[PDB]
Scaffold this active site. Structure first.
Site, short mmCIF file in Angstrom:
data_model
loop_
_atom_site.label_atom_id
_atom_site.label_comp_id
_atom_site.label_asym_id
_atom_site.label_seq_id
_atom_site.Cartn_x
_atom_site.Cartn_y
_atom_site.Cartn_z
N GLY A 74 0.82 -1.19 0.00
CA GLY A 74 0.00 0.00 0.00
C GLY A 74 0.86 1.26 0.00
O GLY A 74 0.38 2.35 -0.26
N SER A 79 3.72 1.29 -1.94
CA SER A 79 4.47 1.19 -3.23
C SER A 79 4.17 2.35 -4.15
O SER A 79 3.01 2.71 -4.36
CB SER A 79 4.14 -0.12 -3.94
OG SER A 79 4.37 -1.23 -3.10
N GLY A 80 5.20 2.93 -4.73
CA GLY A 80 4.97 4.07 -5.62
C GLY A 80 5.21 5.37 -4.85
O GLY A 80 5.46 6.42 -5.43
#
Lengths: 14, 241
Positions: free
Chosen positions: B189, B191-192
């Site tokens: 959750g 990630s990015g």
């Protein structure tokens, strides 16, 4: 191994 | 870029993290599907672009939520911005997760303010050394609905790739940088999202949350996409579009 040192998925995209 | 109008308080007030001061990580955005499900994070790099991880699978059906999203005053100043085009780095490796970066061009510019601004991008030659205390943010899982718990922040150190390989071995590629294993961890959750480090007072995107322990163990380091290795591609993409 031996105990809970064996996670299966040890890795994963976050 | 890289300077919050509302200063973060680094002690705090992601696993083992703390709530950020509301509005103190401007560039941090939440990627949500139409139903409104937050599935990854990202960072605004200018008013028209967001940088995130390639493995997140973002499409133009997803939306970027910028602002004081779920963070301290919660449902606060926010902008839901639709996405016009997705630019996945062609070097992305869906198996090793190497070169985990994608650029999102918004259809509508974000309105910058005290609570919405850009993170700084590093130059490819920049040197972010092992041991440096950097910060990672996100609404991701707080233990492996996850309405996000409230935006979290965590201070953690960068590791050298050789020290990272002691834990992860061959999965570690040149385009990855690890951080953590110090009592805190990024998690699903997150990630990015960004891993930022201060260079001369400006918070600079050194990494993009990519992957790690399935367990989000706080004694295993996380792995981030190494922006220094991907930033030239970012510049070319922006210049081209």
């Amino acid at each position: 191994i031996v105990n809970g040192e064996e996670a299966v998925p040890g890795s994963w995209p976050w | 870029c890289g300077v919050p109008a509302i200063q973060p308080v680094l002690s705090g007030l992601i696993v083992n993290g703390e709530e950020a001061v509301p509005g103190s990580w401007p560039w941090q955005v939440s990627l949500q599907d139409k139903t409104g499900f937050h599935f990854c994070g990202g960072s605004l790099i200018n008013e028209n672009w967001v940088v995130t991880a390639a493995h997140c699978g973002v499409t133009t059906s997803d939306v970027v939520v910028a602002g004081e999203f779920d963070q301290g005053s919660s449902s606060e100043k926010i902008q839901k911005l639709k996405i016009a085009k997705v630019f996945k780095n062609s070097k992305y490796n869906s198996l090793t997760i190497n070169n985990d970066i994608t650029l999102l061009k918004l259809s509508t510019a974000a309105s910058f303010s005290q609570t919405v601004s850009a993170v700084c991008l590093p130059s490819a030659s920049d040197d972010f050394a092992a041991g440096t205390t950097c910060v990672t943010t996100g609404w991701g899982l707080t233990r492996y609905a996850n309405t996000p718990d409230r935006l979290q922040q965590a201070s953690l150190p960068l590791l050298s790739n050789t020290n990272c390989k002691k834990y992860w071995g061959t999965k570690i590629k040149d385009a990855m940088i690890c951080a953590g294993a110090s009592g805190v961890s990024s998690c699903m959750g997150d990630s990015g999202g960004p891993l930022v480090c201060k260079k001369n007072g400006a918070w600079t995107l050194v990494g993009i949350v990519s992957w790690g322990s399935s367990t989000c163990s706080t004694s295993t380091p996380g792995v981030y996409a190494r922006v220094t290795a991907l930033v030239n591609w970012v510049q070319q993409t922006l210049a081209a579009n």
